[PDB]
Amino acid sequence: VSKPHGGKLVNRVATEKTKEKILEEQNEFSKVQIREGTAIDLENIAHGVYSPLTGFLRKDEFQSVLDNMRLPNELPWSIPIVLDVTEKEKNFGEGDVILLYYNDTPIAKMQVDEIYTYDKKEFAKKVFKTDEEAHPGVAKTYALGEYLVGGEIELLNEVPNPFKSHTLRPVETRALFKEKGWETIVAFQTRNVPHLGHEYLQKLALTFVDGVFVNPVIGKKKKGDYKDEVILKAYETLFEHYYPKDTDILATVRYEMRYAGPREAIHHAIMRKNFGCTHFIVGRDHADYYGPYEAQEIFQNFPDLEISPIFFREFYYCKKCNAIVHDRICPHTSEYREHFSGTKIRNMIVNGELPPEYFMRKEVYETIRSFENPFVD
Amino acid sequence: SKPHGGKLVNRVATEKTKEKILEEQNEFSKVQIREGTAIDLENIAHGVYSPLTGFLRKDEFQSVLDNMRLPNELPWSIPIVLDVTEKEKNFGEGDVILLYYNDTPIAKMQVDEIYTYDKKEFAKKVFKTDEEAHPGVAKTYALGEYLVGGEIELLNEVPNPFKSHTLRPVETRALFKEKGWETIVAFQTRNVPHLGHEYLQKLALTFVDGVFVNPVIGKKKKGDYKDEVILKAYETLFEHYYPKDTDILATVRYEMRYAGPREAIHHAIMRKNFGCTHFIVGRDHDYYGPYEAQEIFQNFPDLEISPIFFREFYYCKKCNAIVHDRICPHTSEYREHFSGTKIRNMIVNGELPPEYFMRKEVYETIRSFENPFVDE
Ligand SMILES: [Ca+2]
Ligand SMILES: [Ca+2]
Ligand SMILES: [Ca+2]
Ligand SMILES: [Zn+2]
Ligand SMILES: [Zn+2]
């Protein structure tokens, strides 16, 4: 079985009685405006996706994840979940109860345990292994406010979720896995439609794992990216036409990527552990500044993670062997070899090209096409 | 990587020894042997049957029957014996005799003992049945009433059209070492490669250094591939689809007994002597179960060659790949199971095998032969 990171699955969803009280006096508490990513962090805290966390890191915890990728008690935790405010936005003090607003929506109530300062260069360097402003995460770290705020939270509202019905929470996914008699579950994280390489990895894992938990991540989109609804419906087509039934589950999680590379891959595994997964597929270049095998290399420092990473050797499609192969068993030259790249396959479709069937399933392509505009913007 | 019994046997007579024995064949009694026995003689003499240096005596014959092991407990499952009738027994114990295939002296033999046997016990213990319809049972009954044990010395081989491909254990071992191979997996066959065969061999290559493909030359039936077709088809396959220094091809001559699981052990022993560390055991290796050939290896933990059993696989015409039921949901019409007999029948009937059954270049190589098949 998979135990929740830290021992118990966290739940911070405020009770209807607690929600009514706080919202009856919104204007008496200090209101702090948060970004959407922080609003998503809050729902991940409240539904146990971030177990054991019950709020935003305090100073001791924050410095510990920076220096060691572990909490003070040595439990693995690699991605700082913090709340920042500028001098002018700090309309509260330690010991105060504050309300975090996304736009005009009260997202959560927070008990301010501690207000502290930090070194943005140290923050940037230890998390992303670089302090170059060109790095997106470094830039977002420098834009942070001067003060971080720690303390336990309680969720009052979620950001509107067009895909609520797919957004199963850890308590539901765990009950579902057991519902299906799965003892081992392998997680596959993605932000793209499935191509044949992704199907190969998932079915490879099925030969020593009971089921696959495909977990599309809902986050900020870039122009040219597949619409989440396209990704969802594409996978539903893939399973119906190519997967045995009761061998896969599709559920979505919301999460704003930090692009901290190998340090973020550990965070990804922790999230999937809490969803109930015992294994986690780690692809190359997970989360320009990080090497392809860096995200696999870091797991050697966490033998106490209690979620088994799965590393796959390099494979490609050969147009002479007519099969997914690897260099050991294929003598064919570069023209015959087709390496899988979701980005290149995505660019074919944007450019009016048909992906060959060794890149994408016929029915998957026709589902993507069934959309007037599959991509954002 | 060590020969069964400890050391590689060699019973090939030196040319000075051979000549002196052939200068006056007059002195020795002549005994006419069947071709299959002549094949057994060259397998003895080139170490394919190590530790055996000749035909088994009584104590060894009975032990193989009862325990599938020699008196010293070394695994040996197939008796290698020489049979003569009362009329053919123009010799006694202690005599030196000459074994002849037609007018060719195949070997010189020192007779240790002449003993009798129970043909029904023989047939039953080896083949698990005494049904005369069983080919091996009938050939056991046609054996002469006397078996003859003793060490042999080979003087000639029956003509071999495939001599150049019939590398002996001492040269295969030197070749495995020359290619830096530490582990070697044997794949025995009597058919052309289809994509299932290639799948298995390349699967093994992911955890062994190289593959030793070993076509077995024996009696043919009407409709069988000619052995030169099989060989040329494999050299076409390797050249077009295998990396260099991952495959070796060599032939061994051997007449099947059809003893099922008991012969699979004997097959693995032969490949051990050739230098292999692993041995692929195909299903149904008539009267025996498909997994029995795999079940028997449990009783031989000391065999020192590792059997390799593979899970069921087939080609799916919707997945467009070799898969297995665990990962494929599609119904029977999309599933193509690999049968060497079905694929061979197609070619005999003038049909083109789909490329998911047989490589394009392999089929073209088979086509290059005007009469690829054996005719009665
Ligand atoms: Ca700042
Ligand atoms: Ca005697
Ligand atoms: Ca008889
Ligand atoms: Zn190839
Ligand atoms: Zn299929």
Residue numbers in the entry:
A (entry chain A): 2 to 288, 292 to 381
B (entry chain B): 3 to 287, 292 to 382
Provide text from the study.
Methanothermococcus thermolithotrophicus is the only known methanogen that grows on sulfate as its sole sulfur source, uniquely uniting methanogenesis and sulfate reduction. Here we use physiological, biochemical and structural analyses to provide a snapshot of the complete sulfate reduction pathway of this methanogenic archaeon. M. thermolithotrophicus activates SO42− by conventional ATPS and APSK, but transforms it further by uncanonical enzymes.
Inside the cell, SO42− is activated by an ATP sulfurylase (ATPS) to generate adenosine 5′-phosphosulfate (APS). The structure exhibits the typical ATPS fold comprising three domains (domain I, 1–156; domain II, 164–314 and domain III, 320–382). Similar to many thermophilic bacteria and archaea, the domain III contains a zinc-binding domain (320–343) that might contribute to thermal stability. All residues critical for the reaction are conserved in MtATPS, arguing for a conserved reaction mechanism.
